[PDB]
Symmetry: D2
Subunit: 387 residues, 4 copies
Amino acid sequence: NYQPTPEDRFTFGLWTVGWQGRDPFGDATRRALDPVESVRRLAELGAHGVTFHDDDLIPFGSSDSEREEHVKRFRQALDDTGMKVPMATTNLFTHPVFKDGGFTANDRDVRRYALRKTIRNIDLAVELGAETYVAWGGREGAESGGAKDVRDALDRMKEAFDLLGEYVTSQGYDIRFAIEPKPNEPRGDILLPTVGHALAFIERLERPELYGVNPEVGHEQMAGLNFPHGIAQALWAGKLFHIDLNGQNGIKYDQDLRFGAGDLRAAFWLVDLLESAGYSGPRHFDFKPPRTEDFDGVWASAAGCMRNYLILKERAAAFRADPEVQEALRASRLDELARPTAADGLQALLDDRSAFEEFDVDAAAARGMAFERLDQLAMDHLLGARG
Amino acid sequence: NYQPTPEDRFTFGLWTVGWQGRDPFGDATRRALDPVESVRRLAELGAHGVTFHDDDLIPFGSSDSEREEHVKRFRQALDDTGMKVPMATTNLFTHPVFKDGGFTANDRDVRRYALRKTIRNIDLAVELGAETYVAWGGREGAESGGAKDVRDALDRMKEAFDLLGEYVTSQGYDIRFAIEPKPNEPRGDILLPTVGHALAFIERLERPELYGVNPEVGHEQMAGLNFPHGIAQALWAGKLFHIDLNGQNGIKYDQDLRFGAGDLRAAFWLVDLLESAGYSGPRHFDFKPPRTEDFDGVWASAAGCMRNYLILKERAAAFRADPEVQEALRASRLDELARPTAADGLQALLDDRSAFEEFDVDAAAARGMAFERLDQLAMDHLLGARG
Amino acid sequence: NYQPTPEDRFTFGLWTVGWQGRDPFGDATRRALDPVESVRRLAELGAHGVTFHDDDLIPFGSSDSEREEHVKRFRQALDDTGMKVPMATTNLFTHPVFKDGGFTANDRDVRRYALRKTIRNIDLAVELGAETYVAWGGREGAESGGAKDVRDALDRMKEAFDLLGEYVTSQGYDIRFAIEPKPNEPRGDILLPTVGHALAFIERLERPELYGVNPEVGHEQMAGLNFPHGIAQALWAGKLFHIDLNGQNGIKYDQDLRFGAGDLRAAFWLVDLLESAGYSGPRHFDFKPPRTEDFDGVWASAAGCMRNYLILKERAAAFRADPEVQEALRASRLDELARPTAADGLQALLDDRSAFEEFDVDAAAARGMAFERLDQLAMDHLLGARG
Amino acid sequence: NYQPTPEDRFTFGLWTVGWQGRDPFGDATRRALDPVESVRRLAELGAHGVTFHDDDLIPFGSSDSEREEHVKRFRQALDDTGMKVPMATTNLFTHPVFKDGGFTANDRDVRRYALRKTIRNIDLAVELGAETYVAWGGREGAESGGAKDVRDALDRMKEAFDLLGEYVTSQGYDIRFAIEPKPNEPRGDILLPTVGHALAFIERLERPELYGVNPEVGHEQMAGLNFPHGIAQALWAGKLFHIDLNGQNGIKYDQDLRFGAGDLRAAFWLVDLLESAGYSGPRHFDFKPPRTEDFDGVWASAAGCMRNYLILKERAAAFRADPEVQEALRASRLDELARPTAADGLQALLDDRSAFEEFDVDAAAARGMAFERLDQLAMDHLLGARG
Ligand SMILES: OC[C@H]1O[C@H](O)[C@H](O)[C@@H](O)[C@@H]1O
Ligand SMILES: OC[C@H]1O[C@H](O)[C@H](O)[C@@H](O)[C@@H]1O
Ligand SMILES: OC[C@H]1O[C@H](O)[C@H](O)[C@@H](O)[C@@H]1O
Ligand SMILES: OC[C@H]1O[C@H](O)[C@H](O)[C@@H](O)[C@@H]1O
Ligand SMILES: OC[C@H]1O[C@H](O)[C@H](O)[C@@H](O)[C@@H]1O
Ligand SMILES: OC[C@H]1O[C@H](O)[C@H](O)[C@@H](O)[C@@H]1O
Ligand SMILES: OC[C@H]1O[C@H](O)[C@H](O)[C@@H](O)[C@@H]1O
Ligand SMILES: OC[C@H]1O[C@H](O)[C@H](O)[C@@H](O)[C@@H]1O
Ligand SMILES: OC[C@H]1O[C@](O)(CO)[C@@H](O)[C@@H]1O
Ligand SMILES: OC[C@H]1O[C@](O)(CO)[C@@H](O)[C@@H]1O
Ligand SMILES: OC[C@H]1O[C@](O)(CO)[C@@H](O)[C@@H]1O
Ligand SMILES: OC[C@H]1O[C@](O)(CO)[C@@H](O)[C@@H]1O
Ligand SMILES: OC[C@H]1O[C@](O)(CO)[C@@H](O)[C@@H]1O
Ligand SMILES: OC[C@H]1O[C@](O)(CO)[C@@H](O)[C@@H]1O
Ligand SMILES: OC[C@H]1O[C@](O)(CO)[C@@H](O)[C@@H]1O
Ligand SMILES: OC[C@H]1O[C@](O)(CO)[C@@H](O)[C@@H]1O
Ligand SMILES: [Mn+2]
Ligand SMILES: [Mn+2]
Ligand SMILES: [Mn+2]
Ligand SMILES: [Mn+2]
Ligand SMILES: [Mn+2]
Ligand SMILES: [Mn+2]
Ligand SMILES: [Mn+2]
Ligand SMILES: [Mn+2]
Ligand SMILES: [Mn+2]
Ligand SMILES: [Mn+2]
Ligand SMILES: [Mn+2]
Ligand SMILES: [Mn+2]
Ligand SMILES: [Mn+2]
Ligand SMILES: [Mn+2]
Ligand SMILES: [Mn+2]
Ligand SMILES: [Mn+2]
Ligand SMILES: [Mn+2]
Ligand SMILES: [Mn+2]
Ligand SMILES: [Mn+2]
Ligand SMILES: [Mn+2]
Ligand SMILES: [Mn+2]
Ligand SMILES: [Mn+2]
C-alpha cells in the first residue's frame, strides 16, 4: 500500500538525500553522495525527478571540461532512469563571497557576480528541461539594523529579478522564477521573509507574470504562520509555481524534517488543499535525513516523505467524498462562503434594509458554526477512525 | 526635555487609554472613560489627535438620538482642544454576530451587515476629518482547517474592499483605506497575517491605489518578524498610509505595551527609518495601559509613548550625524547598496568579464563588512554613551 | 467505537464546557451553564468526573447560605450521576484585587487574602473528595522589569505554599498540591513559567513531598517546549500528580483547543508515555469550545476530547505491541539506553581502556541510529496505515 | 569612558572570537585563530580571562606530544597576559560519534567515552585554575518521539553527573559543575531545556551542592522566556555558578550576538539584577562575531560585549540612585513584596478577619500599582534622558 510512482510527481533536491550531516555544532556524519547514485536510488523508490543547485551538480571552481563531464554523467543517469529535472536553482549562500548576500550584497561587484552565476545556471536548467527556476535569498538580510537599508536592498532585489526576466525573455526561454521565502537563518532576518512579502514584491517587478513563489512548509512555520493558508493565498493569486514539502516542529531553526513529520495536521490540510485545487506542479521534498542516520535511514526517510503524502492524500480524498462531511460543510456554511456577498451591487446593498436597519443581529449571533463537529470528522478521517 | 507638541503628530485610539482592563482571565480594573475626558487629557499631554472605532464613540445599539448626543459631546471636546481625528475604523470583532468574521463570515448576511456598518462609519469619519480608514480583520480566519476555505474567503475579502472603494469614489470622499495585519488572536490564524500578505492582497483589488497598510509593531513581532524591515517594504511600495506604535515582548499574545517598551532596539531602528524616510502620517499609539494601573498610570503610560518616540528620534539623529558613523557607513558600503547593480544593462553585464571569469572572488570574500563596529556606534548613540 | 466510559478517568473543569466565549476582543457568545447541567451532560458523555474553581461553583460574594445552596445542588447532581470531583482549585485571577497576583501581589494584604480564599476552598475540596488541589498563578509575574523582584516573589510563593502545607498537615487532609505552569498570559511573564521551574521550586519547599505539577499541553507549547519530554521529567521526579489535556498550535496566546487538535503527533507521544508509565491520575481536559460554537458544538468538542484520547491510546498500544516496532526499538538501541552506563563504578570506568584509549570512535560514529524507520512505523501506526 | 579592566571579570570562550564563520549554509569566512592570539588580543581589550572546550585547545585526535605543545603555548600566553581560566568544558557535540548524545547516547559505549573524555579535561581545567566545569548537553535529545525514552535518558544523565561528582570528590578538586540549558538546536528538542529543568534535575543528583547552572541569555530566549526572571530563580536557589552573556532576537536559531544586541531591555534588567545581587562570578561572553566580519570586526564585537555591560551597569546604578525612582519603588510597594506575608504564622492568619471577612477587596483593587511610571523612569535612565 502507498507505494509511490512517477504519476505522483515526487521530486527531491540532490542536496536533500545528499546532505552529509554538517550542522552549526557538528561535522558530517555521512560521505558525499554521487549525484548519479542519488538519481538511480530515487528512481527505484518511485520518484519522478530531481532538482539541483549549480554547485550540487558541478563542484564550485570546476573547469569547463570537468563541468561538461559532471553534466554528461548526470544526463546519462537521467536517461537510463527516465528521471526528470523540473526545477533548478543557484547556490548564492555557501561561498564566503556571499556572506552579505548575492543580489543584495552591499558590494556591487558581488551583486553582479551573483547575477552572472545565476544566469549561467539558468542556461543549464533550460538544457536539462527545467520549467521552474527557484531563488532562495538565504543570505539577503542582516543581523543589525544599520547594515542593510531594506528599501535599497529591495531596489537591488527588483533590479536583479528584472534583469533575469529580461534575460529569459531575450533568449526565448520557457522557464519561470519561483521565489522561496524564509524568515531568518542563516541571516538574523531574511528579506521577503514570508509568502506574503514575496507575493507583494513580485507585483512591483517589470514582468510580474514570470514570477511566483516556491513556499516551504517549515519556513512559514518558522514565523508561526499557517502554511495551508499561505498556499491558499498563493493559489488565489495564480502564483504557486512550485512547492517544498517537509516538516517542522514550530518556531526554531529550520529542521527540514521528512514530510508528514512536524505538524501532521497542517500536512493533512495542505494535501487536501493541493489536491482540491488541482495543483499540477512537482511535489518536491526539501528535507534532510537527520544526521543520526546512515544511508539506509537516508533512503527510509526519503521513502517516508512520499508515503506520508500518499496516506494523507487518501484521507483527504475520503474526507471530501464522505457525504457526512459534505453535510457538515453545509451545516458550517462553507457553501455560503463561496457565494458573492453583493452581486446585486453597491446601491442595492445600501438599499437593502434587511442588511442593516432590519438585520436581526442577535438571531444571526445565536447560530452555531458547527466547526468542531466538522473538525472532528476531519480528525476521524485523518486517523482512519471513521466509526 | 522631550515634551511632545501637537506638531509631532502623536495620536491615540479611544480604546487605548479607555481600555478598562478586561482580559480573558479577568474583570475590568478601571471604570469606563468618557471620550471627552480622553480627548482633553491627551491634548494636555501634547497629543495631535484621536481615533475611534464606531463602537468606542457610539455604543453598539444606540438610538439615533443617543448617537447624536455622543457625537456632539465628542465634537465639542475636539473643538475645545484642537485635536484632530486623522483615522477611524469599524468594530467588526466584538459583537457575537462577528464570531466567524465580518467581511469573510461564512454567513452571507453577516458579510453584508459588516459592510453596511463599515459604510455608515466611513461617513462619520469623513465628517470628523479622517484621512485614513483602517480595517483590521481580527475575526477573519479560523481555529480549524475545514472551517474556512481561504480562497473563497479572499474572494469575499476582495469583494468587500472593492465595494468600499466604489463607495468612497461614488461619494467623492478623499479618504483612503489601510489594512492592519495581525497573524493570530482572537482567531487561531487570521487572514492576511502580515504586512506582506496585506500588501500582496491589495494589488489584486480593483482600485489598488486607494489601499495601503496600517502595520502594528507588536503584530509583526507576533510572527517573529523584523518590524523595521516590514515598514521599509511598505514604504518601498508607497503603501505606508498609517502606523500603530506600541511594544511587544516576542511571540505571544498581543501585549500592546506602551511604545518604547518591548523590543527597544527595534523601536530605535523604526524611528530612524520613519524620520529618515520623512514619513508624514500620524504617529498613532495602539497600546493598553496595563490593568495593574489606575487612571494616573493610564496617563503616565500614554505620555511615555510620546516621550520614547522623541528620545529615540534624538538618538537616531545623533547617530546619523556622528562623523564616526558616517565613516562607518562608508566602510560598510551602505552607499554602494544604494547604487545600481547594472545600470550598464543586461548585455554589458553579460559581457563584463570582471563580473564573472575575472572576478577575484577570494579578495571580495576576505573584505569584512564592518557591521559590528557600525552597530556598536548605533548602540552607543541609543544609550547616550555618545552625544 | 472509541466510546468513553468512567474507566478512562476523563474529567472536565466546569469552566471548560461552561466558558461563555468572552475573549480579549469579544463578548460572550453562549449563556452561562448551570453546574448541575454540566455534571449531568458530561456524565451522559462518559466522563468520570468534574473539577472546579471556588468561583465557578459559588459566585464570588455569595452569602454563607447561598453558598450552602450552590454546594448542595451540585452534590445532589454528583450523587445522582456518580460523578466525582478529583481536583479543585482557586480563582486567584479574575477579581481586580488580584491584578498584581494573589500569593505574590506586591500588596501584603492581598497576599493574605489570597491564602484565606485558597484555604476556604481547600476545606470544600476535601469535603467533595478531591485528592489534588491545583494552583495556577496566572497573575503572578510582571509586564515590566522593575515591578516585581522575582527573588522576593519566590520567597512569597514559597511562604504561601509552605503555609498551605502546614494547613493541610494540621488538619490531617489527604490532599496534594499540583502547581500548573504557564509561561505568560495574562501577565507578560508568569513566574514558574514551565514544568522545570515548578519542579525546581517545589524542592525548596519545607514539605516537598506534598507538591507536584499539573502540566498543561498548551502551556509548555507556548514556550515551544516538547510536552511529552516535560511529562517524562515530571514522571522521573515522581511529581506528575495531575495533568491538563488540550491542544495548541504553537507559540501564541493560550488556545485551549480540544485534545487531539493542535500538535497531533505530540498528543500521540503523550498518550503513549502516560499509558506506558501507568499514569493513574485523572485525564483532565482543560479546553474551551471555540466561541463559534453553540451548545451542541460545546458537547461535540467535549466528546472529541475523549474520542481522540481513545484513538491515540489504541494506536500507541498497537505501536508498542507490534513486533516489528520492537525490532526497530532494538535496532535504534532503546534497550541499551535503559542499561546503566557504569554499574562497574568509577574506578572500573577509569581503568577500562576500551572506553577511551582503545575506543574506536570512527566505528561507533558510523553506526546509524535507525530513528527514521522507527518514526515512520510510529507514523504508520498513528494513521492506521500499517502495510 | 566604559573601558573594561580585568577587575570587571569579563571572560570569553576561545570558540567565540575563534569562530571561523561556518554555519549550516556556508563555509568559513575567517581563518583559524591561534588561541595565543585570542588570549593576547582579549587581554589588550581589558578581559579577565578565557575558557575552552578540550577540542578548542587540543584538536580532536591529537597525540600526547601535540597536546603538550598546544597547552604549553596556551599556558605561556596566559602567563604573559595575566589572563585567568575560570571555566572549562567538554566538546561532546562536534564529533560524529556524539550524534545521538554523549551522556545520553543510546549506545552505552559512547556514554562511557563521553565520561572519559570529560574526566580527562576536568584534570586539565584544574591544572589551569578553573573553578567551574560546564556541561552543555547539545546532543542530548531527539528529532522524533520514539528515539529517546526520556525517563531512561534522565537516569543516564544522573548517572553521568553523579560519576563526575564522585570523581572530583575522590580527587579533592575544588571545581564545581554547571549545567547550561538550551531548548533545541542542534537536536529537535534538547533534554533539560531551560534553567528550571536543569535546576530540578540537580536536586535529584547524589551530591546536589556540587552542581549549579550556567544559563545563557539567548538560550532562555529561544523558549520565549524572561532571562532576568530565570536568573533570579537561579540566584534564589543558590545556583548561579556561571553565566553566558550574549544577544538573541527572539525565538529562532541560536544567534549568539554580542552582549547588548538583541533584547536590550532584558540586558538592562539582567545587569541590574547581577549587580544588585552582588554576583561575583565571571561575566562570560558566549557570542559569535557575525560571519560578515573580518578579524578587525571580531575585536570590535568582543569589545562591544564588555562596553555594553559597563554602560548598562552605569545606567542601572543611576536608575537605582534616582530619588524619583526610590519614591516610585515605594509607590509600587516593592518594599512590601520583600516582607513576609504572614510571619504572624498560620493560626494568626486564619484568625485575622482583616485578611478575609473584613478585607475591603474593592479598595485594594482600586489602588493602582504605578508600574508604568516606574518603568518609564527605568527607560529614561537606560536611554540617558535622565543622568
Ligand atoms: O558554541 C558553538 C561553537 O563551539 C565549538 O567550537 C564548535 O566546534 C563550533 O563549530 C560551534 O558552532
Ligand atoms: O532554493 C533551493 C534551496 O536552497 C537551500 O538548500 C535551502 O536551505 C532551501 O530551503 C531551498 O529550498
Ligand atoms: O532608502 C530610501 C531611499 O532609497 C530608496 O530605495 C529610493 O530609491 C529613494 O528615493 C529613497 O529616498
Ligand atoms: O480594538 C483595537 C483593535 O482595532 C484597531 O483597528 C486596532 O489597530 C487593532 O490592533 C485592535 O485590536
Ligand atoms: O484593540 C483592542 C480593544 O479594542 C476595542 O475597544 C474592544 O472593545 C476591546 O475590548 C479590545 O480588546
Ligand atoms: O488551575 C485551574 C485553571 O485555572 C484557569 O482556568 C486557567 O486558565 C487554567 O489553565 C487552569 O488549568
Ligand atoms: O531580592 C534579593 C533579596 O531578597 C531575597 O529574596 C533574599 O531573602 C535576600 O537576602 C536578598 O538579598
Ligand atoms: O560550542 C559552544 C558550545 O559549548 C559551550 O559550553 C556553550 O556555552 C554553548 O552555548 C555552545 O554552543
Ligand atoms: O542544526 C540542526 C540541523 O539538523 C537539521 O534539522 C537536519 O536534521 C538541519 O536542518 C539543521 O541545520
Ligand atoms: O475571568 C474569566 C475566566 O473565568 C474562568 O471560568 C475561571 O473560572 C476562566 O477560563 C476564564 O478565562
Ligand atoms: O433615543 C432613544 C434612546 O434613548 C434612551 O432612552 C436613553 O436612556 C434609550 O434607552 C433609548 O433607546
Ligand atoms: O496589558 C494589556 C494586554 O494584557 C492582556 O490583558 C493579557 O491577556 C491583553 O489582552 C492586553 O493586550
Ligand atoms: O482570544 C482567543 C480566545 O479563544 C480561545 O482560544 C478559545 O477558542 C481562548 O483560549 C482565547 O482567550
Ligand atoms: O553549505 C552547505 C549547504 O549545501 C547545500 O547542499 C546546498 O546545495 C545545503 O543544504 C547545505 O546547507
Ligand atoms: O606526536 C605525534 C604527532 O605529531 C605529528 O607528527 C605532527 O605532524 C602528528 O601527525 C603525529 O601523530
Ligand atoms: O553569527 C553567528 C550565528 O549565525 C549562524 O551562523 C546562522 O546559521 C549561527 O549558527 C551562529 O550562532
Ligand atoms: Mn498511486
Ligand atoms: Mn537561484
Ligand atoms: Mn539609507
Ligand atoms: Mn510538533
Ligand atoms: Mn528549510
Ligand atoms: Mn526549501
Ligand atoms: Mn483583513
Ligand atoms: Mn523583550
Ligand atoms: Mn496589538
Ligand atoms: Mn493595532
Ligand atoms: Mn538608489
Ligand atoms: Mn473503553
Ligand atoms: Mn489554587
Ligand atoms: Mn530588590
Ligand atoms: Mn499546528
Ligand atoms: Mn491553557
Ligand atoms: Mn490549565
Ligand atoms: Mn545537559
Ligand atoms: Mn529583537
Ligand atoms: Mn547560544
Ligand atoms: Mn553558551
Ligand atoms: Mn524579604
